[PDB]
Design a protein around this ligand. Sequence first.
Ligand SMILES: Nc1ncnc2c1ncn2[C@@H]1O[C@H](COP(=O)(O)OP(=O)(O)O)[C@@H](O)[C@H]1O
Ligand SMILES: Nc1ncnc2c1ncn2[C@@H]1O[C@H](COP(=O)(O)OP(=O)(O)O)[C@@H](O)[C@H]1O
Ligand SMILES: Nc1ncnc2c1ncn2[C@@H]1O[C@H](COP(=O)(O)OP(=O)(O)O)[C@@H](O)[C@H]1O
Ligand SMILES: Nc1ncnc2c1ncn2[C@@H]1O[C@H](COP(=O)(O)OP(=O)(O)O)[C@@H](O)[C@H]1O
Ligand SMILES: Nc1ncnc2c1ncn2[C@@H]1O[C@H](COP(=O)(O)OP(=O)(O)O)[C@@H](O)[C@H]1O
Ligand SMILES: [Mg+2]
Ligand SMILES: [Mg+2]
Ligand SMILES: [Mg+2]
Ligand SMILES: [Mg+2]
Ligand SMILES: [Mg+2]
Lengths: 370, 370, 370, 370, 370
Amino acid sequence: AALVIDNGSGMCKAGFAGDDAPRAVFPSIVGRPRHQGIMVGMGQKDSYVGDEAQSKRGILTLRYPIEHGIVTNWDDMEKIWHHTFYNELRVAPEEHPVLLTEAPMNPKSNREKMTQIMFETFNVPAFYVSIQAVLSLYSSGRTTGIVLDSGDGVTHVVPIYAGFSLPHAILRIDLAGRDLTDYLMKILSERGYSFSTTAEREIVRDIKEKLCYVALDFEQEMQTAAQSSSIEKSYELPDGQVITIGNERFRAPEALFHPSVLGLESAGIDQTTYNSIMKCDVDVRKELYGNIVMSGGTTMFPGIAERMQKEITALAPSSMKVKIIAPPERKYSVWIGGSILASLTTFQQMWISKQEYDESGPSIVHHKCF
Amino acid sequence: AALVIDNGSGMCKAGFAGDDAPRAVFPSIVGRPRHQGIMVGMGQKDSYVGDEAQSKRGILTLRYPIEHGIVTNWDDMEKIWHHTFYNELRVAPEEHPVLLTEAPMNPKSNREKMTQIMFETFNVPAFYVSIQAVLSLYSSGRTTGIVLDSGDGVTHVVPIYAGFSLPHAILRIDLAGRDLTDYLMKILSERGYSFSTTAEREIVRDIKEKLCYVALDFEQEMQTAAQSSSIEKSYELPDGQVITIGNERFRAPEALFHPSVLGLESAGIDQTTYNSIMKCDVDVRKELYGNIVMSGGTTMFPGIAERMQKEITALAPSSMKVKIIAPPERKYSVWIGGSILASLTTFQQMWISKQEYDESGPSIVHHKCF
Amino acid sequence: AALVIDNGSGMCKAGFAGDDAPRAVFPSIVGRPRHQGIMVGMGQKDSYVGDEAQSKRGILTLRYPIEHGIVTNWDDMEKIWHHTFYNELRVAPEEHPVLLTEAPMNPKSNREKMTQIMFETFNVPAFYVSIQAVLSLYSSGRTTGIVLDSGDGVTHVVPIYAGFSLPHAILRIDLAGRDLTDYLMKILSERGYSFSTTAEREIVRDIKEKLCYVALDFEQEMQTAAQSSSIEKSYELPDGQVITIGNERFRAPEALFHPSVLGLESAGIDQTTYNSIMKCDVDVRKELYGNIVMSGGTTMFPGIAERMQKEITALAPSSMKVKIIAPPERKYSVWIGGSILASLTTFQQMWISKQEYDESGPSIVHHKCF
Amino acid sequence: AALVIDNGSGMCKAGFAGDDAPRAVFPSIVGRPRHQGIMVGMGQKDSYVGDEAQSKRGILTLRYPIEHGIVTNWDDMEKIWHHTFYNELRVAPEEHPVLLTEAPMNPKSNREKMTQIMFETFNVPAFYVSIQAVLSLYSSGRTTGIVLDSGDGVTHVVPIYAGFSLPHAILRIDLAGRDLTDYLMKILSERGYSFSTTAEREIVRDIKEKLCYVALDFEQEMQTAAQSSSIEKSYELPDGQVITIGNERFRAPEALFHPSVLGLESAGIDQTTYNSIMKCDVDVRKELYGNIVMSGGTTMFPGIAERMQKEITALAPSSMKVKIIAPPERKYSVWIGGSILASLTTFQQMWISKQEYDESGPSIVHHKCF
Amino acid sequence: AALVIDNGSGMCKAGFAGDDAPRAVFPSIVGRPRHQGIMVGMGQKDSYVGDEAQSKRGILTLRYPIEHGIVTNWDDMEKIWHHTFYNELRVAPEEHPVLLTEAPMNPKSNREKMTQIMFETFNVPAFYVSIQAVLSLYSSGRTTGIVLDSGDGVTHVVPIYAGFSLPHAILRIDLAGRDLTDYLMKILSERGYSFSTTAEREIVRDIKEKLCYVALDFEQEMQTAAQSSSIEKSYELPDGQVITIGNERFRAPEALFHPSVLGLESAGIDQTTYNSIMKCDVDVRKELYGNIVMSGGTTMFPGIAERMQKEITALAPSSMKVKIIAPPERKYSVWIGGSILASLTTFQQMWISKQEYDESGPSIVHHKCF
Ligand SMILES: Nc1ncnc2c1ncn2[C@@H]1O[C@H](COP(=O)(O)OP(=O)(O)O)[C@@H](O)[C@H]1O
Ligand SMILES: Nc1ncnc2c1ncn2[C@@H]1O[C@H](COP(=O)(O)OP(=O)(O)O)[C@@H](O)[C@H]1O
Ligand SMILES: Nc1ncnc2c1ncn2[C@@H]1O[C@H](COP(=O)(O)OP(=O)(O)O)[C@@H](O)[C@H]1O
Ligand SMILES: Nc1ncnc2c1ncn2[C@@H]1O[C@H](COP(=O)(O)OP(=O)(O)O)[C@@H](O)[C@H]1O
Ligand SMILES: Nc1ncnc2c1ncn2[C@@H]1O[C@H](COP(=O)(O)OP(=O)(O)O)[C@@H](O)[C@H]1O
Ligand SMILES: [Mg+2]
Ligand SMILES: [Mg+2]
Ligand SMILES: [Mg+2]
Ligand SMILES: [Mg+2]
Ligand SMILES: [Mg+2]
């Protein structure tokens, strides 16, 4: 059986095919020491990965080797896969085909470089790469739908109808978990919590994943926050400091619908979604107002689905069955879908083999991999 | 018992002989994918037919393999019969003689090619082809009359008297449901509804079949539309958009009487009808001002019969019994007539047999088939 | 003397009648601030036009008020004419009749609204609107020809014979400079150049207008680009970044002949042209294979005329004198033609006057304006 | 005429509006006695300010009530304004509107508390607060630029284009005169000069402001200092001790470009500047590689501008007009700008009045003050 | 095996590596005669060391050649090592590598001079110097912690996390056993015990090391001493005089938390500790509120750990696991740690060799020694 890796921008997710739940999950980041290891007595190393990285942030600089789905640092990137194979899953990569994922319309160079690394350094027997949305759709068995995947690095809308892509209406957005965290960090610095080290950035991420939520009406909840204590929940900073976060718990996520606050010209996810639907033929729009499938951790806010519902119903003509699907498997949907795909017999012919790569090398992927 | 297929230009109609109602009806069109089927997991196909085609327009290009009664794409055409036999009626074509239909004066090549396909690929035991008008006349039992058949592809006038054809006065016209739909599409694009994909073309057809009607006086109803809301009915586009169509609901059908609007030099159906009557001997004109029988879906507009009545009475001398017959079976008249013909015992000698075709092949048909 | 404005979808062109060259040219766009003007000391404004807009893209959102020849934003549209009169040409609109242009079969509402604005707010003494193709034909003095006008917003084919229109064969296409720019933006994002702000969109337009060209054989030049450096010219992004564009320099324009790449079902300009010719009577087709006149900036690619020649000669029967005319005045042809028309004495009776509009208002235009 | 106070983190600067030069300058610090005043005969006091503080350091503890632009000690802070009004300028605060300044993105509480103090205790008639960068830009009349302000407490980069802020690209850094002094104190303690009382800290500041300079190449000048006397200039400690400072004269300022030496993860001013430029749209980057305006005393090192030039030109693409502007008015630029702003007539409507504050109190400022 | 010397400011501690207990301990002081040795008959000498010095204080002047970790008198300093090698341990220094210790941030000159003396005059085969805190941490095996070392000459706080130093948060204080003894001498002189010869100073040290203790509440125990006999313990001066010491038994040590009494501006050890913790990143503060390790004889007061606990818990946020570790090995911790370090095999490559010193001399140490 093959092996599935999502290579999520923010947190790698990996496991054996045919499993409904990912075995291994960890932050797709590396740790580099910035301080002198003068305590010779200990077996220190120049690099750290995942959990170890999280445990040592204050010693380390943190770098995300994936930005906006772009591998900007191949050397450190290799360590993520290296750890995933040799330490985490303890799997010989020569023994299994492997599946990878990428952002749509991602720069063609990187897919080649990725394939090169897989076939050369890990010497995998066979390989394939799929667009995340397709897998995430398989995770719900539907074959008519529109996917919002919103990982740490990108948010993109892909329509799929009866198993066909409509690439002319693929649309992507730079807003994602990372930049949303950056904005949250900014507004928190109107309180004393000014953070801004790469170490503290990761703690803001935790705070967001714990305590943020999406308002059904921005002016309503802003009024309530101006006029009540009740929103101003506490949180325990690791040093035991008590931070109180008010409207910011929602004023941040609001960016996904009014990105102008974040100074991005591109519209929010809802508006982009409507645009993409409208870019498709009128023959299909019905089914694409159904089957709005959320995916990825940025869809893990509470309330977000309701806001999307309300906005889309405000944009669509009435008497249209606007329906949003937000399964609780959202955070692992991509990997679930990949696990499903790898089990199909017919798909077993889809793999690119060692022989094929040897025949034409990386360029071959553009001919079959989608 | 034999089997009857109309092979209508726009929608195939098929069933067993001796039935007063056609069993199977579907659009005589094929669907070709234009977009990549990257969702391997699903069992997609390269071709679609009829209902499936209608259900997937936005994925597909649509092609009518019949134009103006001419089979321009024999390969895709074969699929229509193929579906009709094997899926729709679930009938072995070796077990039944089959009846087909054609436009009058249709190009002699195609009748041969059709016969070749029937006897070679479907290997039918016996075969015959009849001019649509004759069948449509049998559908009303009359044997003195003049038929207007106006399918999707052609409109033609055939007089028949006491069972005899008058081929010297056969007259055909290129105006038909398809080109009338095209014109309707044009004028709608003076509003925002500009459509013009092959997918949307089919929706214009539905709109026409739902909402168009024929004016008894063009200047009258144009004045009223200029001076009232009441004509400007709504329609629900499949995407839930609300389109409001005004005078266009009739300004389109008007083309059948003033084709100059459509830029065709040939006169309208009424004028052509009068011309054809006048081309016959004065011995018969009486009976041919009676027994104007409408046929085919373009005669399915409301009001059309009244307009024809008024025009013909304006052309004919007064004190002539201009009478128009518009049975509600219009839309299926051709197939009804064919079903009737196939039941006659004497007609059972009319069939061309496997033996006869083997004797002389396709050319044989010109000797007996009319 | 009257005044001529093209109101081109992408760039307004204006000047006095009787001039062979347009006096004033600027992008028909408005600029809206998205960022806070906290530097009170400066006299900022809420709106910007043309050159000012180009100079401030990074501050501004850009909106084209013309899409597909449709004025979708009348309020901002008014500013374009307002600037054109009061700042650019410095002309009192009460002192001169004015000529405007529109796409063929453009939605009838907008012509009325335009006339209303001209006679009410600008209070022009007299007014007329002409279809762009007719003017562009006058620009070459011919009176038998077929025009391809391909502005930023639309591309449409109009045949004209001896001064007569054949509206039944008018055909329009949504492909135009804007959507072609969008496609170019897409494929560039396979390299790192992902752009996609409304500001950067305008820079892609410049890049296209500088560096794109049409292949005489797609597979040939694709092979060469796969097998040579020589196509991969450089360009200097305004930030000094060096972008290298390869096959994309032509793979984009190719869309005009294989729009399926752009996911539009409608055929390319060549195929549409052949269709339109075939829609005309055989009496005229000879002259319409001559006198293929290019117009508008999308015809400003190098090589395009040759590709059209080769395609049309592949579609037409041989021994037909396929001839294409691509004067270097292409980019200003429409305005040139308008300048010519306004000088004719007989045309001076064609104008609609203040009196006439007062008599019947906007609806009057449909009776005389073509 | 209004009155302008910078409330600089390290040294208050104050004077009447419309003056090109600040009237009053003194260190924004308070002095508290730590030793018993047993010499009753003298009129001692529990508090000292500015010059008096400087004259008595050895008796006193010194506290900066401003840290990182944050007023951490409002009680002692009040004395700074109190002295400024009543002793220094000898001005009744009821007679003049007053202007104040703050760090960008400074914690929202403090702006309110400041306004409260101004309107309640000083009972000023009207008040306004501006971001330092904006004023410093007005000091050079430019309206396109990027400001580095680097006071004692903060260093922050703000881009401004044509008078518009781009808050999404505002970036701040904790490195500033104070912490740089602390580092200098540290390395001097590798020689005998170990200082580290709050009194001696102030003398290190003087030494820095007299004798430090920025290297154009760190390894070059380190080599020269390892291989020459010539850098090892003398200084006269107030007790007459002779201190010799070598490479430290530059190894300290180097921190602003390699803060890792100071153990801050955030990059240097140059890198941050490039990041901020890149955060702006490509429409404006050209003008922001021009008009790099230095401000505040940390930009008062010799050589710093050249180092910035070299670094930025190393980061920017070549053929970009990297230009740095370092007017000799740097040390007073903020106050100059404020003096200019207060003279503008239109700005006279910008003030918040006693009435407005009474209407809504401190919260009002967030609605108008930027 | 190598040899370990602490060169403690107040008492040298020396022995062979790999021993858990130091072999040799004596006061790091020299004795110089001030009185005429007229009793020729005896073999007197001009110098005395350690025990001999203690036995002859009344004849001698005593000088500490180490002050604040600074070797101020290299000539007399040499005798300490000279005695340590040749008399005390009876070891040839050519036969063993030797380890030394220094205060953090100690003036760079002295480390060089020390190395020079070791390699030149003692001609040791190999040498290394380590910061005291690191060794003292190894003495407890921990590798996350913060060390308070408080010898006779200095008290300094060093954080270490997972074996990494955070030099940016190293902080040192001049308060130490010597100056605390001086203060105790002062307050005793409010009783008759005015001492103040360099001889008597040493007896005050003994009294302190015997009879002082730290109050858990200063005002509490001051009240009790004002209201009870019970604190006023006796001591036997060497001349048999009976001295009674009351609150002074604690009013002295209190200086370490309220140094203002000693007229030092720098805060106490607790406050400095909190400051240092706060100077580290929030990623690590948790572990640094644990693992407060005491070291050196000034941590040998009873009660001190409890006072530190109470203060730190008063400064830290509650629900933080403030834990203090005060092993009874405190007084010898540094030497224990050094003994441990010298046994590690990997450390055996850390030594500087005779060859290396010969290559570059003293300056070499700054490249490897930490
Ligand atoms: N409960 C949550 N609430 C808000 N944001 C979350 C939550 N869980 C995860 N996230 C965000 O989603 C990111 C991961 O999303 P994911 O789809 O896994 O991206 P990728 O697939 O590229 O790793 C996290 O880093 C975080 O920013
Ligand atoms: N109710 C209706 N109103 C107007 N047009 C109709 C209606 N019903 C059918 N049509 C037109 O008639 C066409 C079919 O006519 P038909 O006689 O079946 O042609 P064919 O026999 O060649 O299939 C339809 O495609 C449509 O354009
Ligand atoms: N040299 C060129 N090469 C390619 N495209 C061009 C060139 N010049 C102009 N264009 C395209 O043509 C557009 C303008 O064409 P135009 O006919 O003026 O449209 P309109 O008349 O509606 O303004 C430009 O915005 C650009 O997209
Ligand atoms: N000539 C100089 N060289 C180096 N540093 C200087 C010089 N002059 C001033 N400084 C530093 O700049 C600080 C004051 O800068 P300033 O911009 O006034 O800060 P603020 O505006 O917050 O008072 C001084 O305290 C000192 O540290
Ligand atoms: N039991 C004790 N109580 C109080 N102070 C002590 C005690 N033991 C030692 N000291 C103080 O600690 C000093 C020695 O501490 P130490 O850490 O050895 O300094 P160094 O390491 O520099 O020699 C002694 O000189 C004395 O002042
Ligand atoms: Mg993912
Ligand atoms: Mg039919
Ligand atoms: Mg134009
Ligand atoms: Mg300042
Ligand atoms: Mg010691």
